[PDB]
């Protein structure tokens, strides 16, 4: 299961 | 032994050709099991391993939505990095990410990791401590500060120690017949004539799994590591791998050299001669 809702760069 | 869940993510801008290409390929150990391609006829997260049929339709809907969301955040990231690096809107650029976790044989977390790269060069990476970031340049220093104020590391740590670990355990279970198998290699040597009374001896190892293997050529008991030609272990199309290693020897002296194959599926190492 993948990661999500990541902070943008 | 240890097991890993890894995701190779790529975002490539295509100026003039429309939206960026976005892909996600997942792996449990050396086995590809899931994949998303934005250029796909119908962009959906799809199974790549037979054992993934055990996941309900809800799994595929969740993962697909996540991917589309991840696709969007990376479209923005591509724009942002152009600013950071003061680059023009007409060039193609790439963002690569490696995300994953590894567990021991007993299922506990050994380590987690997440690394980003821009145009083939390191950008930012989570440190082994799972708490700090390390930037490769000044541009990445801006992202580092943003991530520190946002609390990204705490958020990511939660994923790596929880979700990642739990789902890894589950995948290994549902696909244990595939993921926990051991295909023993089959080896053989070939001969090739060369100018100046020399010959190329090549030792092949085929149809093995896991990918980890050791091929060596010996003479008088010593392993001729420096005098070996060798390819990186490669997938053969059916979930198994192959590899070869060669050595150029004097004509008529071939019989002295032996090939040794080491793999978990071989209780005792294979020894070959031409």
């Amino acid at each position: 299961s993948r990661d999500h809702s990541r902070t943008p760069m | 032994g240890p097991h890993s869940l890894r995701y190779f993510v790529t975002a490539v801008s295509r100026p003039g050709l429309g939206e960026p290409r976005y892909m996600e390929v997942g792996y449990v150990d050396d086995t590809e099991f899931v994949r998303f391609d934005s250029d796909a006829e119908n962009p959906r997260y799809e199974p790549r391993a037979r054992w993934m049929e055990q996941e309900g339709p809800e799994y595929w809907e969740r993962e697909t939505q996540k991917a589309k969301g991840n696709e969007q955040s990376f479209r923005v990231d591509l724009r942002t990095l152009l600013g950071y690096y003061n680059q023009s809107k007409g060039g193609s650029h790439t963002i690569q990410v490696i995300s994953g976790c590894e567990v021991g044989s007993d299922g506990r977390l050994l380590r987690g990791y997440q690394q980003y790269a821009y145009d083939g060069c390191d950008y930012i990476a989570l440190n082994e401590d799972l708490k700090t970031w390390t930037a490769a340049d000044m541009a990445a220093l801006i992202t580092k500060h943003k991530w520190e104020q946002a609390g990204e590391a705490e958020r990511l740590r939660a994923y790596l120690e929880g979700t990642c670990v739990e789902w890894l355990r589950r995948y290994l279970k549902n696909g244990n017949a595939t993921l926990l198998r051991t295909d023993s290699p089959k080896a053989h040597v070939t001969h090739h004539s060369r100018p100046e009374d020399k010959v190329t001896l090549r030792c092949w190892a085929l149809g093995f799994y896991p990918a980890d293997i050791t091929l060596t050529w010996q003479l008088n008991g010593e392993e001729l590591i420096q005098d070996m030609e060798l390819v990186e272990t490669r997938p053969a199309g059916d979930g198994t791998f192959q590899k070869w290693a060669s050595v150029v020897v004097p004509l008529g002296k071939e019989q002295y050299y032996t090939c040794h194959v080491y793999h978990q599926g071989l209780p005792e190492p294979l020894t070959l001669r031409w």
Binding site: - | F8, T10, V12, R21, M23, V25, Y27, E32, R48, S92, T94, Q96, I98, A117, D119, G120, C121, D122, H188, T190, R202, L206, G207, V231, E232, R234, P235, A236, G237, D238, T240, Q242
Partner: protein, 99 residues
């Protein structure tokens, strides 16, 4: 970063004319990711070719696998033609069944 791809062509099992098999074209260590890969039977393009096993190495260069099922014959020639910005013209690597 611009890296020229290494192209390896090989089959799953030792060929035996008449026995079904899988032909692989592993394109490795390249950058950027834009690339065109074609597998050819007798100079003609093979249709059912599956691309799999994509990954990056430590240095971030790309690895991709193209493969199709085939049944070797003593008169059929197979090759893999790759096109990438790092090359002037398309590179064609032939299957050497005697390797």
């Amino acid at each position: 970063i611009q890296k020229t791809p290494q192209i390896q062509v090989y089959s799953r099992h030792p060929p035996e004319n008449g026995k079904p098999n899988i032909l692989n074209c592993y394109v490795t260590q390249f950058h950027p990711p834009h690339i065109e890969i074609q597998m050819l039977k007798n100079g003609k393009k093979i249709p059912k070719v599956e691309m799999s096993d994509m990954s990056f190495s430590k240095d971030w260069s790309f690895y991709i696998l193209a493969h199709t099922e085939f049944t070797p014959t003593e008169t059929d020639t197979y090759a893999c033609r790759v096109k990438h910005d790092s090359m002037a013209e398309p590179k064609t690597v032939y299957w050497d069944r005697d390797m």
